[PDB]
Amino acid sequence: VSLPRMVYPQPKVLTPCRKDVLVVTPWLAPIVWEGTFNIDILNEQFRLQNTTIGLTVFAIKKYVAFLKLFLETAEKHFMVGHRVHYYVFTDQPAAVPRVTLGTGRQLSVLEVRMRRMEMISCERRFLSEVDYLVCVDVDMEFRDHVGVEILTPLFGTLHPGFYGSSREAFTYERRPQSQAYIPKDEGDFYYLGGFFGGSVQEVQRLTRACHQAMMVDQANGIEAVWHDESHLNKYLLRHKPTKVLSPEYLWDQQLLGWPAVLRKLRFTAVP
Amino acid sequence: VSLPRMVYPQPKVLTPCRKDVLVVTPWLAPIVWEGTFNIDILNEQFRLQNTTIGLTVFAIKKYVAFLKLFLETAEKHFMVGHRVHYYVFTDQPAAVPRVTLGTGRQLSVLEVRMRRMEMISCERRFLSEVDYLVCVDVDMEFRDHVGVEILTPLFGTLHPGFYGSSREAFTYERRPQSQAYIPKDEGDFYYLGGFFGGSVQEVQRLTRACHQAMMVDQANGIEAVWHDESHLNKYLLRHKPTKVLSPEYLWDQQLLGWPAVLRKLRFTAVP
Numbered sequence A, B: 001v002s003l004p005r006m007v008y009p010q011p012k013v014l015t016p017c018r019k020d021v022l023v024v025t026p027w028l029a030p031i032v033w034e035g036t037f038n039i040d041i042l043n044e045q046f047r048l049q050n051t052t053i054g055l056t057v058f059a060i061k062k063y064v065a066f067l068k069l070f071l072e073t074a075e076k077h078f079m080v081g082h083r084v085h086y087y088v089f090t091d092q093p094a095a096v097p098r099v100t101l102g103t104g105r106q107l108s109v110l111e112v113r114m115r116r117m118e119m120i121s122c123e124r125r126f127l128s129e130v131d132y133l134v135c136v137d138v139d140m141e142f143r144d145h146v147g148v149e150i151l152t153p154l155f156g157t158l159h160p161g162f163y164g165s166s167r168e169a170f171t172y173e174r175r176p177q178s179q180a181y182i183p184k185d186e187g188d189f190y191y192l193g194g195f196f197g198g199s200v201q202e203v204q205r206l207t208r209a210c211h212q213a214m215m216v217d218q219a220n221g222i223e224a225v226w227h228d229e230s231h232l233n234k235y236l237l238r239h240k241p242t243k244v245l246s247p248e249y250l251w252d253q254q255l256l257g258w259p260a261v262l263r264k265l266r267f268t269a270v271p
């Protein structure tokens, strides 16, 4: 379908949006920073396709206390104007708070008792209900826009403690006996376990692969240094994401401040 | 499928590849420039999928004289290592020169008598034979690498006489009675009629749409200022390409020199 007529500033080939940061990976995936995207054009494109986004959150034992702020801030900032289906995985269905949702948005509570990967790979339901899955930590809050600019077949998010580091400094799993093993001379980025996603197909592949690798490590008496994050990082090394989210998309202002290079802090740790 | 282990320089989030040029459109499509891509990673990715690329060229009447240099330079520079199927559309089958081709590459002569769009929309054959179609002018020669970095569902190429211009300066069709009409305040870029492409599906859509719009203009006694290029530009305005090729991909050194911003001249006009 054709975009309607729209009026917006012209891109200029000879003036970069951002000259301070890398905005495209070497396999030609956009790195999403403020100033790189016109949200109006993106909103039009995803709306024309009637895109539905699923958002998965786990809230088990004490973590149920984080849902109320998580959800209420999601209502302000996460895919507003688009269809959204929250999937809350919890051991305590009656501790899920009652959060008023905007039109076109709905919330399912799934009772459950490193196995987020496993639980995410609920497979037939997701395929019939949403186009994209976004998989985040619950101990977080949205503080600014997190929209359709993220959507793509496969994305991860650059780890805040790690974006300036040489790769030998990255906390990849370094022991060869782990399936998550990455040697010292390999690696593009350090991606966070707490904010990843993609098409339902690609996320099911990812979560399947990672769950299979963690089972293999288990049977071999090995647990990867950073658990499911370590396996994610090996997956994304071998299967390059089609977008990378900048640290704007997962930050901790208490621990890391608010540097100039981050024009927006969109989704952050809770105090 | 998983990429094998590979060793290559680390991307650095805090050091851009290119700070002199826009490398991502505002709808998050890569703009392909030298220094933005690691060809080794891209080659691995497209090879794992056994990608076949079709290259369509029209060589009608006197233009048959251009085929020999076109083809021989294509053999040196165009998708080398990948499977390639040249489709030469000509009124003179016996004037197609005999050009030795590398392994995994083949050439079909199609006899024919603004209607490139029409002829390109040969529909069932392309779908069964190639993954991507690239559609270029014949009066051209390859001088450097033109590879898989271009491939994507839909691409155009930024016009050399126009990449620094404000949009009101672009030679879009400006009369409202043409289907190719773009007003003064709209437009992202000026794309060349001579180098476009995409998945077979997306190119058939494009060529279909443009052929339909040119038929409508015909029945109304109108011909767009720059013919099929004008319609391409309207199409790509309303359906944004998923990559944009920089002017490295279509240049005229005689007329425009070799500016510093172009690190490579890959495909150029013939003297």
Ligand SMILES: O=c1ccn([C@@H]2O[C@H](COP(=O)(O)OP(=O)(O)O)[C@@H](O)[C@H]2O)c(=O)[nH]1
Residues within 6 Å of the ligand: A058, A059, A060, A061, A063, A114, A136, A137, A138, A139, A194
């Ligand atoms: O119900 C949960 C449990 C964990 N997490 C996230 O995953 C991280 C670590 O998981 P886990 O607690 O199992 O590791 P541990 O804290 O026990 O060492 C937490 O810090 C959170 O940011 C979450 O979102 N919901």
Ligand SMILES: O=c1ccn([C@@H]2O[C@H](COP(=O)(O)OP(=O)(O)O)[C@@H](O)[C@H]2O)c(=O)[nH]1
Residues within 6 Å of the ligand: B058, B059, B060, B061, B063, B114, B136, B137, B138, B139, B194
């Ligand atoms: O057999 C042909 C005829 C044209 N062209 C390309 O399309 C352009 C213009 O087409 P055409 O010649 O129909 O316009 P005209 O030159 O007659 O004004 C030429 O300059 C070429 O760059 C081509 O590749 N092959």
Ligand SMILES: OC[C@H]1O[C@@H](O)[C@H](O)[C@@H](O)[C@H]1O
Residues within 6 Å of the ligand: A159, A161, A171, A192, A226, A229
């Ligand atoms: O080195 C990787 C680790 O770095 C810590 O800052 C983070 O809190 C961990 O969850 C993990 O990402």
Ligand SMILES: OC[C@H]1O[C@@H](O)[C@H](O)[C@@H](O)[C@H]1O
Residues within 6 Å of the ligand: B159, B161, B171, B192, B226, B229
């Ligand atoms: O203004 C658009 C025109 O610009 C000319 O340089 C080019 O040779 C034409 O074919 C067309 O692109």
